[PDB]
Each structure stands twice: as structure tokens, then as C-alpha cells.
Design a protein around this ligand. Structure first.
Ligand SMILES: [N]
Length: 184
């Protein structure tokens, strides 16, 4: 189960974060660390599409080749804190698994600047028992975490040394598909 009420960034700039561009996960920390693989690739796009706040997700297990995309229309709980009832889609937005009650994640932006971010996400998916998952994001898929975001990790009372990097997995991303999924 999730256990953290993550605090959103003071002064979070939603229009900058939700600008339609792609964020790559560079490092992640799962508080129940056998819940997710030790090697992984994920990315997201975040934006407003026809007035609706949206997020598109991409996951890829670099060892198993398991791939999936998702889209959600996000609901606001408070500035920087969202609830996302997701649908699994193919890369073109065709629905594979429809939105359903109890399939949602929450999403808190703890720190963001134009290039980097720290987020907390709590996934709920059917009767699975999942824990808190923090992610360091960057606009550049290869970027090492800088001082701004690492300081934010410390300010959240987390140890960056415990985060698992995604950089050594040969991750390649379809940026076009994430951007276009925002409209789907
Ligand atoms: N996740």
C-alpha cells in the first residue's frame, strides 16, 4: 500500500510542467522495492489538450520487452497533486483497456523546473497491492540528476543513493507517440 502524502512544490508552475512536452524517468525509488523490476524504462508527456489536463505514459521492461502506453485525463486535488484514471492504449491511442473504477494513480509534483522534476506516484490497479514510487524526471533522457533535483530528493527526506537509474538499459522512446497520445 502507499504510505506517503507527498507535498507539492511551493509555487508549482502548472503551465510549464503541463506544456505538452516529454519527461523521461532517469531514476526511480519504489518504497516496496520488489514491486517493480530493477531495470526499467518509463517516460510521460503532460499537457492540456482541448482544455483537458492530460498525461500519456510509456513503460518498457528492457529485459522482457513488456511495453504499454496509457492516457488519462487528470483531476486536480490541489496545485501539483492529481488523480489519473488511466486507460491502456496502443501507441496510436486505440483503447486496449478502458477506464475503470479503481484503476487510477495519484501524481504529486514535489519539485520542478524547466528541465527536471521529482514526482511521487501511487498506483491503484484492481486488487494489486502497490507502494509509493518516486521518480526523477528530466527533459533530456540522458541527463544525470543535477543539484536542484537532488536537493529536492533530500528535502523530501529521501536518499538519492537509493534511487535506481534507468540509464544503462538502452532505453529508446517514441516521443511522437507520447505527444500525440495527449489528444487521445
Ligand atoms: N508504476
Amino acid at each position: 500500500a502507499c504510505t506517503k502524502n507527498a507535498i507539492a512544490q511551493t509555487g508549482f508552475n502548472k503551465d510549464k510542467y503541463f506544456n505538452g512536452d516529454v519527461w523521461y524517468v532517469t531514476d526511480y525509488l519504489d518504497l516496496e522495492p520488489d514491486d517493480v523490476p530493477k531495470r526499467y524504462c518509463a517516460a510521460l508527456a503532460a499537457g492540456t489538450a482541448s482544455g483537458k489536463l492530460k498525461e500519456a505514459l510509456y513503460h518498457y521492461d528492457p529485459k522482457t520487452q513488456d511495453t504499454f502506453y496509457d492516457v488519462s485525463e487528470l483531476q486536480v486535488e490541489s496545485l501539483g497533486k492529481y488523480t489519473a484514471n488511466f486507460k491502456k492504449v496502443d501507441k496510436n491511442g486505440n483503447v486496449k483497456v478502458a477506464v475503470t473504477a479503481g484503476n487510477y494513480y495519484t501524481f504529486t509534483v514535489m519539485y520542478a523546473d524547466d528541465s527536471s522534476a521529482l514526482i511521487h506516484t501511487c498506483l491503484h490497479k484492481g486488487n494489486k497491492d502497490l507502494g509509493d514510487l518516486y521518480a526523477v524526471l528530466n527533459r533530456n533522457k540522458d541527463a544525470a540528476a543535477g543539484d536542484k533535483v537532488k536537493s529536492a530528493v533530500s528535502a523530501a527526506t529521501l536518499e538519492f543513493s537509493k534511487f535506481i537509474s534507468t540509464k544503462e538499459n538502452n532505453c529508446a522512446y517514441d516521443n511522437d507517440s507520447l505527444k500525440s497520445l495527449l489528444t487521445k
